[PDB]
Design a protein around this ligand. Structure first.
Ligand code: R9M
Ligand code: R9M
Ligand code: R9M
Ligand code: CL
Ligand code: NA
Lengths: 305, 306
């Protein structure tokens, strides 16, 4: 029993974290095979960050201008290239701790583990959702840049996120490992704001299924609804529309608990309209939307990699 | 710049997790140097559940009755002893992945990371607190016994918890790594129940300090309180008594925010009276009690968002 916000075990990713320094800028890199991945803005000063020409700044740099440190070991850089907003530094040594991995781009509403790092040293691990507005509600300080996000599937690490910046509202923005931003952000010192966010409906429903599996049942009711009726309520409450694909994904939890997705939507309708009437669900007084259906099945059945 | 339940990186503990089998019972063990630590109840059978005599069950085992598997490698058991409720199996190989480590017994209110494991394989990592009633609110299914709790301050792993059992309310009980239970619990299937739990007052205050560091002041007030008047109010909401030790421990957070500890106490008194009026603090609509003053200083900025 019990339901907790749970990260993937971080050991496979800890063995890949290095320190990258260019001039006075130090941040984290990801050392896989013979390449170190890091944000391209490592080559910038503060002056540069106002209106940077990355092409221009990089051609003026050579391999020896990148200091890469793996624990107390200096790696020899033998090449440097840019892919979108990520810098790739070829080193003369393959990382002997490289796990089986691939690069994946996640969808809004999907979850991942962040390994928060400073100076190439892992500091903490926590679970995040890619928000509908493509930010993450992370916990990051100066030096966290190049910290990475990932999932594990069997023995394969799927890298999905590299940390680039904090927004004025205290939320965070970054790229996939191919250097493509999540959301309408750029790597420059300029005016940028998180768009108005929305609640991830399919995840709230998953979390209500988690609650029922853990004996929290007060919110259940005799009623059912339709996708169209529910989606009018969703729109009003700044909830994402529920699709047939989402209903299908919750199929397992519907079956296991005997509450149909639209049976649970009728619960969620009542909660949005009426509140929790002083009650809690799984120790929260808010409707939690950072657990996916997979997260709930996974945690409630003890999958292990 | 954000505030999250953050666990320690789990890699140094992952490299220590093994499977222990005795009879038909398999759970997790912790392989440090040439010793594997696991719950002694691995030697129990379907009848020896209510009133097991561990000394009598153990003297009937040879080293070769314990199957210890580190991934695909079988370890050879060359010695066994019991210390309180923990079994120690001496093995003929020291774990090459043993980190710098120590064993520490924690007090209620302290936090730690749990590496939930099944069949000696890690499933996930999350943060817990030792509750005032000596339980933890974990996420544990059948086969998770031998899963451990730890902190990592400065490359040294401090092991503080080993998971033994789930109580009827769905909360979790276990031991330190010397095998002494936290709380009045025993490794027997006799009827056991957690005491009435209380809120960890010092941690709620630390978290309110966290909220101020991250730029939120809406819940503050112009009032102060005596420590005694605070405790008379707080206990009416099932809050732990705040001691002068707890006041002292909050001094650095008080200094960083310029909010006196007893002024923050007056803010907490008012929040208990009013609730949050549909507002949130650090993403919660409840008062969070599983962040310590040390956790807030580790995670939060040295500079306050004024
Ligand atoms: O500057 C960095 O290291 C990354 C962006 C930030 N994230 C949080 C605070 S500053
Ligand atoms: O746990 C015990 O000591 C007895 C349990 C039993 N099982 C069958 C008969 S009596
Ligand atoms: O610990 C075990 O492996 C059996 C009893 C349980 N402990 C936690 C959930 S069920
Ligand atoms: Cl302690
Ligand atoms: Na219903």
């Amino acid at each position: 029993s019990g339901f907790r916000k749970m990260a993937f075990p971080s050991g496979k990713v800890e063995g890949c974290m290095v320190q990258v320094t260019c001039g006075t800028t130090t941040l984290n890199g990801l050392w896989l095979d013979d390449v170190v991945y890091c944000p391209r803005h490592v080559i910038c000063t503060s002056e540069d960050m106002l209106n940077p020409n990355y092409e221009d700044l990089l051609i003026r740099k050579s391999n020896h201008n990148f200091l890469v440190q793996a624990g107390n070991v200096q790696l020899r850089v033998i090449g440097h290239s840019m892919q979108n907003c990520v810098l790739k530094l070829k080193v003369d040594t393959a990382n002997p701790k490289t796990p089986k991995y691939k690069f994946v781009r996640i969808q809004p509403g999907q979850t991942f583990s962040v390994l928060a790092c400073y100076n190439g040293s892992p500091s903490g691990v926590y679970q995040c959702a890619m928000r509908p507005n493509f930010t993450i509600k992370g916990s990051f300080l100066n030096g966290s840049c190049g910290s990475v996000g990932f999932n594990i599937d069997y023995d394969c690490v799927s890298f999905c996120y590299m940390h680039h910046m904090e927004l004025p509202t205290g939320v965070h923005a970054g790229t996939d490992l191919e250097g493509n931003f999540y959301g309408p952000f750029v790597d420059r010192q300029t005016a940028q704001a998180a768009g108005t966010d929305t609640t991830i409906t399919v995840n709230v429903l998953a979390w209500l299924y988690a609650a029922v599996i853990n004996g929290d049942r007060w919110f259940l009711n005799r009623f059912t609804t339709t996708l169209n009726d529910f989606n009018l309520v969703a729109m009003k409450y700044n909830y994402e529309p529920l699709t047939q694909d989402h209903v299908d994904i919750l199929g397992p939890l519907s079956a296991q608990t005997g509450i149909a997705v639209l049976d649970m939507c009728a619960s969620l309708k009542e909660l949005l309209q009426n509140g929790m009437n002083g009650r809690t669900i799984l120790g929260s007084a808010l409707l939690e939307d950072e657990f996916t259906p997979f997260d709930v099945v996974r945690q409630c059945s003890g999958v292990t990699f």
